[PDB]
Design a protein around this ligand. Structure first.
Ligand code: PEB
Ligand code: PUB
Ligand code: PUB
Ligand code: PUB
Ligand code: PEB
Ligand code: PEB
Ligand code: PEB
Ligand code: PEB
Ligand code: PEB
Ligand code: PEB
Ligand code: PEB
Ligand code: PEB
Ligand code: PEB
Ligand code: PEB
Lengths: 164, 145, 238, 177, 164, 177, 164, 164
């Protein structure tokens, strides 16, 4: 759970000091920008069951060769394990704009994620064909406020650049 | 001069005209930097080894009895001898200010300078192969310094 | 001008000689392998508390003047004691290069990179002294059994040496006293997944660096791993 | 180490449900009184060095049987080591006081110290007196009822987050005993 | 030395990453506080040698014994050498209020103090007899504002929290 | 380590002076141009895993002689080193983008980097290509003139932020050669 | 605990050695000097109630300012406990004379010294102020010998030079 | 070189202490003890040609199988490389009378001696035969005095305890 204020107080443990004025002023900025993203949370979290039906096949419009005989998205027990798993990555980033830090990113989608994609023989470039289409689907008029798709947009291509 | 001439004409040019045979030696050390004034010793033993040979090179700036010759002399007027000192350090700061490609050139040259004109045996061309600045300080015995 | 010995006044050679550049390429390569192991220490932006410098009002600043003055003692060694750990650090650092010819190209090149990579590999896997404590006197008397064996290289002929030197000024090792006893408490309350790798790799740390053929000692390591987490090389006298 | 932000999401993933708009009841409130939080944590550090001579010297005056031969805190090696660990229970809670959860202290201090409080001779009786006064002083140091100091404040309410300074220093005795 | 950003840029340096949205928000409190936090920079630096005279003899008001022989303040230049240092003490905290972080007071002044005052035989309470006269000489609306004022006292007693 | 908020307290130090009232103008302008200075970084580091792959292949399609034998980027191991040190370089100029001073790099990356590619024989002219091509993408990301990613922003002056990422990027080229 | 004898065992402990003819030979001096140092051990003990009283207020005869409230040396219950401290100082200085080193003083007095005089805000030179009256008050032909007057005073200034 | 001086200064060096009261009396015993440990040294130096010669052929009297071909006494020079190697030890134990510890013996005489002999085929059971002949041949009124004979004996059997 990497966060904003857990990132602050740890060096005051690691160097062993007391909380001064310099340590608390970082969370004065955790008033304004903490608020502006939390509107975009439930705006996404109420509709996470709907946006997966255009997010999943956005990979499969690009990669329909994963439905070949002897493949990764070939059949219905893998298809319904695909359509179940595309929003798990968003529930990671649903909690990202809840705490404000990158907690469930660096806790549940990093360690060995480069490994088990190669080890379970599923393409690493497949999810980036599934979720960039979600990030490149931004109409700031009908989505949210102006700044609410600024930090929120930066997560959805962080997983693009971290995973591959 | 007879043991660096490439031609047989150039040999004759040094035998007949003695002021040319002088400055043909001196000009070769300026361009192929095998003088004392261009040699920076790369170690503390070399700075002893270079100091060991020019104690003999300064020893011919004095006569057979130990009184001073006219050759080694660093001043003639009131304040000139101090001005020769503040002169020579700017030579020294710029001798050690060469490029990385020109320290490599005179490293092999001073080794070649010592074992061509002064060495006649195998140990004499061992101090020149191993420490170039010790061979670079080998003067030509027509000076006093 | 003349030589430095006679007839000349001030110093020369403000030029990095060929030995002098060899030290800097050693030091840059050593600071990189130092910082790279500490990236394996803290694997998030949240600090793991084995990077805890000090814990009272002044112990953090007190760890500074001890660490560099200890490094001054490693610089202050004899010609024998510098030629010894030259050859002795590298063949431990050969061993950590498990099957790599490329790393053992440049560990015979940079002896400080040999020195900087052997001890930080231990601190990455926390397979060293104050990172793992035994569970009972079953192993406590066993883990400290090699501890009095290790300092036999420290004091060679009864007279002490500067390897195990603790304080250089008044009231220094007494702040080091209360610090590492907190590390002895910081070693006591680690995670569940954490401690179950410190033991099961210190019993592999000895079997490659110290055992070399003895299947009896492998019984000692695989039942008592904390007795191997004190074993070190001859270079540290302690 | 978590905070009260990252405290509430470890059960939301444990039911795998998204953070709803029903969950915003705590999150509207905490950012709004967030300036009411750190406006008391200034007072916590501003009596740091004097705290280990207030409650700890308020303990030896309750029982002088510790400074003579016969006490745990008899020499200066253990006189300091009682008040050196006085200020650590100031220190670790300050990270947790602004965090809204004791995830900072209760792993690095409260787990393992109970058995560290076993092998020494540190009394269970004098293990609870200092933690009450250094709660009851910070009860006052939130409320500014310090009888010889009233410092600068944006005046109003702060006794709502004075509930945590009692809700934090009870689990010291609940887990060491 | 240490700043507002130095910790959160080393928390991405020791991690070895580009700065995430955790420390992207860390500079938000840097700009909400600077409206009146370097207010006390040149207000102090326009009035610094008035308060060196105001509190610099208010330690000799408390301890009026220092002119006795044997201790420090027994001749004219030694107490004149005191007034340099009590200028220096709100030098390197006046640095700190615009630096934000607590670097150059630890880097220069407050660390190493215990070792040099023991050797040079001067009481560390005999300093804080001057500093504790300053904060109760500050007025809440008159000298600066309130949110300006909290970053004066909480640096001033944090000084004696590490001097005592 | 230093930065522009703490560069002045180095500058005021050696003449024994303070932070005067007229020197604030670089720094009072900082916190108002900081709202766009934070709007500059997340434009860069969103696309950052492409930025080394855009650039070092730009050295490959410029010079294909290095993937031959004899080249310093031939083997499959050494390009894993190269892409690693490709993304190191912008990871540290991104720090000076938030710091505003060169005192991040030549104490952590440039001191001796000139001499540690000497003994490894890394061709320093080839590393200049991996510096400048990264710099060209940086100014196109700041001014948003790069073709195939259109990011929303706030309008206003930004023409001086790209002016300084040139000054940092050419400096790391200035000290490797 | 450090002495002559408990040095050379722990010196010859870790060396894997049996005590040879220097290790015992150091104790060969430790028997004749014990006659001259324990002549002063009990004369201090047989007259210890003298030094605890007209040196503890003679300590106050150059540090008299502590008697004021706000400080910690002001009233009788903080004289009831004040003279108790030098009782622990006149005890601990007696026990060094039956050891042969600075063993019990460093183990019991110096460990933890510097951190409880200043967190109690006690001026630590006032704990040296008693000892200066003690030193040159012990004359040679009356109190101790000439060879016992030197080494108890050599035991004495260790408590001087370690406190500040 | 472990001497009765050097054993204590290294103990105070690594801890970082001055020469204290544990160090004043530790070398008090180097005058009244070395009033007799020198008495064997001028007795050994003026009678070393005979003491070495007596202890030399006492080895060859006992183990007369060294003369055989293959062993360590078969030729004239191996006769001299044995009568030399006791003159070395009768210098080294002369030297540690002058040191007063084990210094010349444990450094230059016995350190790694159990590797040269076992590789060069030298019977270390014959070395203790040639040393112990003089270990009783000393006569407490005739060789030296009894305060010097216990001194000289204690350095021989320490060497005998080493090689055995
Ligand atoms: C070899 C034939 C060859 C290349 C490889 C390539 C290298 C190169 N690219 C530029 C300009 C840009 N590079 C960019 C990076 C990326 N573009 C993307 O679409 C993704 C996001 C990313 C890689 C992950 C960008 C954004 C630009 C700016 C233009 C734009 O608007 O896209 C240069 C410098 C200028 C140039 O030469 O075109 C170079 C050398 N070019 C090659 O010729
Ligand atoms: C594993 C985490 C880590 C890294 C990376 C690191 O460099 N240190 C640890 C934790 C850590 N330490 C500090 C602060 C200090 N550490 C020291 C000790 C070193 N500094 C030195 O100059 C020397 C001598 C060569 C050593 C060993 C010191 C002196 C400090 C400063 C404390 C003080 O002087 O008051 C920090 C905090 C850095 C910050 O953000 O301020 C951390 C996380
Ligand atoms: C490993 C080298 C060694 C030998 C041999 C040995 O006996 N002790 C060590 C080093 C050493 N230390 C001293 C003096 C002190 N050592 C300590 C260490 C403890 N304090 C701590 O905080 C820790 C970490 C857990 C430890 C082990 C202390 C407190 C002292 C006292 C300092 C003093 O009184 O000056 C000595 C020399 C004296 C001695 O006999 O111990 C040596 C060689
Ligand atoms: C000629 C090479 C010499 C031999 C042989 C010798 O024994 N001494 C040389 C001649 C000589 N020079 C002086 C006095 C001075 N020489 C000076 C020049 C040196 N100082 C420098 O900084 C440098 C360049 C790095 C040089 C060459 C200076 C200056 C003096 C002092 C002049 C003065 O007026 O005092 C003497 C006199 C004895 C002496 O050493 O002072 C002699 C014999
Ligand atoms: C005769 C009574 C001995 C015996 C002696 C031999 N020693 C031989 C060689 C040898 N011995 C030493 C150790 C000795 N020399 C020293 O300088 C010192 C310390 C200062 C000591 C203790 C060394 C190092 C060597 C090798 C070098 C040398 O020649 O001195 C030796 C010759 C061995 C050979 O030629 O194979 C002999 C015969 N041999 C015996 O059996 C009894 C015990
Ligand atoms: C369909 C669009 C996807 C796809 C989905 C599949 N995932 C399979 C196994 C699997 N994947 C993960 C990672 C991800 N799923 C999660 O539930 C979580 C976190 C809780 C993460 C990070 C996990 C953990 C698992 C195993 C458990 C599970 O089923 O969720 C899978 C089965 C492959 C196989 O059995 O060989 C499929 C089909 N896979 C694809 O290739 C496309 C891109
Ligand atoms: C077994 C662990 C080692 C050992 C190491 C020593 N560490 C000393 C100080 C010290 N070292 C660290 C570790 C820091 N360096 C790293 O490379 C990494 C991660 C990769 C880290 C975190 C820390 C945190 C400290 C201070 C705390 C402490 O250890 O007490 C040190 C000097 C004495 C001391 O203060 O401990 C040593 C000797 N000790 C050993 O004998 C083996 C080689
Ligand atoms: C005055 C309010 C005090 C007092 C002051 C004295 N200080 C003396 C010497 C001294 N102090 C320092 C540390 C200080 N100087 C600095 O420049 C800085 C950082 C910027 C600090 C913290 C130093 C280095 C020195 C020695 C050099 C010098 O100032 O002469 C001092 C003279 C002692 C002496 O040299 O004999 C005095 C009197 N002492 C007092 O009694 C009052 C309470
Ligand atoms: C009187 C001339 C002094 C002074 C003395 C006070 N000391 C107080 C507490 C105190 N003193 C010591 C040092 C000493 N006492 C010991 O028991 C031992 C070790 C066995 C030593 C070295 C300690 C450790 C303490 C704290 C615990 C205790 O009370 O023993 C004290 C009471 C302070 C209070 O009640 O808070 C006084 C008055 N104080 C002065 O002002 C002058 C200089
Ligand atoms: C036997 C000795 C003995 C003592 C020393 C005191 C110690 C002490 N003080 C307080 C109570 C308190 N203690 C403090 C502490 C301090 N006040 C300050 O100005 C400083 C910051 C700090 C001392 C350096 C404060 C602020 C209060 C609250 C009341 C107040 O002072 O306004 C309490 C708990 C409630 C109470 O009884 O008041 C105790 C036990 N009591 C004792 O019985
Ligand atoms: C980064 C620097 C920083 C600080 C130093 C603190 C300081 C601080 N406190 C408050 C603001 C406040 N502080 C209090 C606090 C109190 N009122 C009381 O009656 C009690 C005595 C006391 C705590 C118990 C209250 C009631 C408010 C206003 C309500 C609110 O802000 O939510 C404010 C906002 C008001 C203003 O702009 O002045 C600030 C900056 N907060 C920060 O962000
Ligand atoms: C914690 C996350 C966090 C951030 C990243 C910043 C985000 C941020 N940037 C700006 C605001 C701005 N950002 C820019 C920057 C640019 N405009 C361009 O056309 C260029 C492409 C680019 C410069 C390189 C400009 C010009 C402004 C307007 C000036 C201003 O509002 O300060 C604003 C104010 C306007 C708005 O509401 O959006 C905010 C909140 N603040 C935060 O709290
Ligand atoms: C903290 C400081 C730090 C850096 C500055 C970087 C850079 C860096 N790269 C390498 C090591 C290397 N670096 C390169 C990179 C290149 N060679 C070229 O010709 C190109 C110009 C460039 C490609 C981008 C290669 C190819 C190697 C390995 C050489 C080999 O395997 O023989 C090394 C030596 C370490 C090692 O060999 O393992 C360092 C320090 N990494 C760091 O950790
Ligand atoms: C362990 C031995 C030991 C001592 C010597 C005394 C030390 C001592 N002497 C005196 C009291 C005295 N002490 C001395 C001794 C001397 N006066 C001098 O001027 C010289 C410096 C010195 C002799 C060389 C004398 C002469 C008195 C009588 C009154 C006085 O002069 O102070 C007092 C005050 C209490 C009293 O009246 O007795 C004390 C503590 N106590 C001891 O426990």
């Amino acid at each position: 759970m990497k966060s904003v204020i857990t990132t602050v107080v740890s060096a005051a443990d690691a160097a062993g000091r007391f909380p001064s004025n310099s340590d608390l002023e970082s969370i004065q900025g955790n008033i304004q920008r903490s608020a502006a993203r939390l509107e975009a949370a439930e705006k996404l979290a109420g509709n996470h069951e709907a946006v997966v039906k255009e997010a999943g096949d956005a990979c499969f419009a690009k990669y329909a060769y994963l439905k070949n005989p002897g493949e990764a998205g070939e059949n219905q027990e893998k298809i319904n394990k695909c359509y179940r798993d595309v929003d798990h990555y968003m529930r990671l980033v649903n909690y990202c704009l809840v705490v404000g830090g990158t907690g469930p990113l660096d806790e549940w989608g990093i360690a060995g994620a480069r490994e088990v994609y190669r080890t379970l023989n599923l393409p690493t470039s497949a999810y980036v064909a599934s979720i960039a289409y979600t990030r490149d689907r931004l109409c700031v008029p009908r989505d949210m406020s102006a700044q609410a798709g600024v930090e929120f947009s930066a997560y959805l291509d962080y997983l693009i650049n971290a995973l591959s | 001069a007879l043991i660096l001439a490439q031609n047989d004409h150039q040999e004759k040019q040094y035998i007949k005209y003695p002021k040319l045979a002088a400055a043909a030696l001196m000009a070769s050390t300026e361009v192929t930097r095998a003088c004392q004034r261009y040699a920076v010793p790369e170690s503390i033993e070399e700075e002893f080894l270079a100091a060991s040979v020019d104690k003999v090179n300064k020893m011919r700036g004095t006569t057979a009895s130990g009184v001073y010759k006219s050759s080694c002399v660093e001043g003639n007027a009131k304040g000139q001898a101090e001005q020769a000192r503040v002169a020579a350090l700017a030579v020294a700061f710029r001798s050690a200010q060469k490029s990385a490609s020109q320290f490599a050139a005179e490293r092999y040259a001073q080794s070649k300078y010592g074992r061509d004109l002064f060495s006649s045996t195998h140990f004499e061309e061992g101090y020149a192969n191993t420490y170039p600045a010790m061979a670079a300080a080998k003067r030509a015995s027509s000076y006093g310094y | 001008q003349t030589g430095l010995v006679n007839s000349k006044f001030s110093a020369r050679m403000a030029k990095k000689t060929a030995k002098q550049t060899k030290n800097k390429v050693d030091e840059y390569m050593a600071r990189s392998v130092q910082r790279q192991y500490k990236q394996a220490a803290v694997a998030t932006g949240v600090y793991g508390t084995q990077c805890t410098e000090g814990t009272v009002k002044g112990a953090a600043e007190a760890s500074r003047s001890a660490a560099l003055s200890r490094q001054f003692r490693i610089k202050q060694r004899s010609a024998f004691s510098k030629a010894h750990d030259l050859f002795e650090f590298r063949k431990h650092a050969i061993i950590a290069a498990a099957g790599c010819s490329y790393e053992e190209k440049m560990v015979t090149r940079f002896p400080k990179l040999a020195a900087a990579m052997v001890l930080g590999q231990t601190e990455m896997m926390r397979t060293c002294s104050r990172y793992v404590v035994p569970e009972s006197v079953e192993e406590e008397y066993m883990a400290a059994s090699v501890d009095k064996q290790m300092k036999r290289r420290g004091a060679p002929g009864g007279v002490y040496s500067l390897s195990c030197a603790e304080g250089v000024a008044k009231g220094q090792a007494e702040i080091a006293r209360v610090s590492a006893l907190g590390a002895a408490y910081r070693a006591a309350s680690k995670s569940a997944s954490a401690v179950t790798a410190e033991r099961y790799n210190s019993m592999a740390y000895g079997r490659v660096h110290f055992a070399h053929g003895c299947s009896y000692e492998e019984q000692q390591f695989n039942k008592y791993p904390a007795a191997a987490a004190a074993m070190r090389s001859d270079s540290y006298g302690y | 180490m978590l905070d009260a932000f990252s405290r509430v999401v470890v059960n939301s993933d444990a039911k795998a449900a998204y953070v709803g708009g029903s969950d915003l009841q705590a999150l509207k409130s905490f950012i709004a009184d967030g300036n009411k939080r750190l406006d008391a944590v200034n007072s916590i550090v501003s009596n740091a060095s004097c705290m280990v001579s207030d409650a700890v010297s308020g303990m030896i005056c309750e029982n002088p049987g510790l400074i003579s031969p016969g006490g745990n805190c008899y020499t200066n090696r253990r006189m300091a080591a009682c008040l050196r660990d006085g200020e650590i229970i100031l220190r670790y809670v300050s990270y947790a006081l602004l965090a809204g959860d004791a995830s900072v202290l209760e792993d690095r201090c409260l787990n393992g110290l109970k058995e560290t409080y076993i092998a020494l001779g540190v009394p269970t009786n004098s293990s609870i007196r200092a933690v009450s006064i250094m709660k009851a002083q910070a009860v006052a140091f939130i409320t500014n009822t310090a009888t010889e100091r009233k410092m600068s404040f944006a005046a109003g309410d702060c006794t709502s987050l004075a509930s945590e300074v009692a809700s934090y220093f009870d689990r010291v005795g609940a887990a060491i005993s």
